[PDB]
């Protein structure tokens, strides 16, 4: 068993690091099963040469909507749950992490099947906020996922490998995804079918 | 589909911006139905020439009250729910947003009918707190809505329009509202009637 | 109706203010009924010549305890609920406020009767944290209430008075309390009695 | 009764203090009963010569896992509950505190018996974040507990002693633990047995 963080708080990642360079999000986001729950996931990179303290991830769904009373809201925003309730949005960012939004009843994608996806007009804004340790100052990074950038039935490729008592990140594969068997029904549709 | 935020985190609003100038709240607040729920809503402007990180909205109700034991609290404060529970008060402020407080059982307006409104002695203090990205420092903006400034049965006019692959804001209409069909009963009264 | 906060965010308190001087907590804390609920309350002062942004109140109970397994914890700490769940601990501090902890089942005082109070060995640490607007920096103020400093069956005297379209604070009375009719049974005892 | 904190916010710990020196976590973590609940606990030290404001503790479980769909997550992170829900992770750090994670159904250790412990490949990362009062800046401290560093059926030795109206900390014993009678069944196993 090779430790991830040593007793003194120093992490064992990127052999010979120094703990502006910019933080990256994967180009695409994927949707696929994790433990019988359907999920939307995107990857968030670290900063090779500093920690980010009080680091947090959040996401907004941007989608123009019409209320049952006919009020039209251009580019309405609602929050996507990526760990707010359990503090799993309080990231320990010391290597690329896959953030996961479980597609449940209060999720906006609850009624969206695979066929249905490309028909929807929406954008997922991902927003990472923290305090760059070295800089002293509060930073923010953002990105965006549009309908055509969400890949149904895929998973993120692993990027973490242990080499010589240090964990190294194959950054080439950061953005890379592979296909996996994934039902094509909506989260709602799977739940109904599951319940009889 | 024209993106709101580009892959690199740069938003497509206010063609040719630079991302002290002061943040504005609409002059008035409106109350009206959104998806069968009665709502109080106010608009919060952005800062044309910077983002506001770790941006959050909150509101206090100021109203002198008397306890069932006869204790009089001048200008008592209680919190108005504008997304605290679901992180929808964690704003992504890159254009004017309508903030919405759904008038439910734990809301202070739950028992307030249209006729009843102008009789009540109360004030809604809205408070926006964030970290002006360019400035480095934590800012706070406030405003106030008194009974006579709350407009029952109205909605905010849309201000967002897509022009030339950039979203522009018709700031003339920022404060403007229009009337819409809205029952005159209290949220409580509508619920009771609804439940038989 | 004289506004508390004007449209531009400027409050109408302390006619002719400038918005180190130190923030004060009342010397004593009181326990008494508010709307059929028993409460512990302490007063927290403002800073006459600046706002405090992202202001929050919290309290710890310090009391040495012994676990059912015989482990002795000197000066154990547990959190006192003063609005954490509903964001009513996110203070809008622009004049002295009475903070209230409702003495319910999850409260530590739930089983403490009036007679019982002076027998208990405990301390309430109150801690106010914010960002002094003028200073730019994060501040913290603390105080302490010991058994003998908690006054059962009392209330805080009002200190807020409207004079000449500005709200003034009679700081002489900041610390002053008066007696009021208050049962002597514990919160638990009142609940049981209430439930038959 | 000797006060822990005086009326003016000054604490009565470390007679003759000044309120870089580094913050320490105990070398080991222990698991044992507190009030019929099984717990994992680690100790977190203070900074002798300053307070830490907006201080908070959090912990991540690092453990490589495989999803029921065969996706392998190297060094997956999930949050350990150390008071997030009740604000007991908002520390009042003015002397060494034992932080406690109660091993309940949503805890990752729920199914881990004593025998089972040394077989598991996992790491507990503890992360303390605050604002060093004197420094003005936001700090972060971290440490790590691996399987072999978790001591089953033990407790932390008390380190706090009252001497001459000041509380002193016997820092020699900071890391020291003693054994105590503790069942060897998992939290799950104890619950089942308990429920008949
Ligand atoms: Ba902060």
TrEMBL record, chains A, B, C, D:
The keyword Amino-acid biosynthesis does not apply. Its main location: membrane. Keywords: Ion channel, Ion transport, Membrane, Phosphoprotein, Potassium, Potassium transport, Transmembrane, Transmembrane helix, Transport, Voltage-gated channel. Coiled coil: none annotated. GO terms for molecular function: G-protein activated inward rectifier potassium channel activity. The keyword Phosphoprotein applies. GO terms for cellular component: inward rectifier potassium channel complex. Belongs to the inward rectifier-type potassium channel (TC 1.A.2.1) family. KCNJ6 subfamily. This is G protein-activated inward rectifier potassium channel 2. It comes from Mus musculus. The chain holds residues 55 to 378 of 425 of the full protein.
């Amino acid at each position: 068993i090779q430790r991830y963080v040593r007793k003194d708080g120093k992490c064992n990642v990127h052999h010979g690091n120094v703990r502006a360079e910019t933080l990256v999000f994967s180009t695409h986001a994927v949707i696929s099963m994790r433990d019988g729950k359907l999920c939307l996931m995107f990857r968030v990179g670290d900063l090779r040469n500093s920690h980010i303290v009080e680091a947090s991830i959040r996401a907004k769904l941007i989608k123009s909507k019409q209320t049952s009373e006919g009020e039209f809201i251009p580019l309405n925003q609602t929050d996507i749950n990526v760990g707010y309730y359990t503090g799993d949005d309080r990231l320990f960012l010391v290597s690329p992490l896959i953030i996961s939004h479980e597609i449940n009843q209060q999720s906006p994608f609850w009624e969206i099947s695979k066929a249905q996806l490309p028909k929807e007009e929406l954008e997922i804004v991902v927003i990472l906020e923290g305090m760059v340790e070295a800089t002293g100052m509060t930073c923010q990074a953002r990105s965006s996922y549009i309908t055509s950038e969400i890949l149904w039935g895929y998973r993120f490729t692993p990027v973490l490998t242990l080499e010589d008592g240090f964990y190294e990140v194959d950054y080439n594969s950061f953005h890379e995804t592979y296909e996996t068997s994934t039902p094509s029904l909506s989260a709602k549709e799977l739940a109904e079918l599951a319940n009889r």
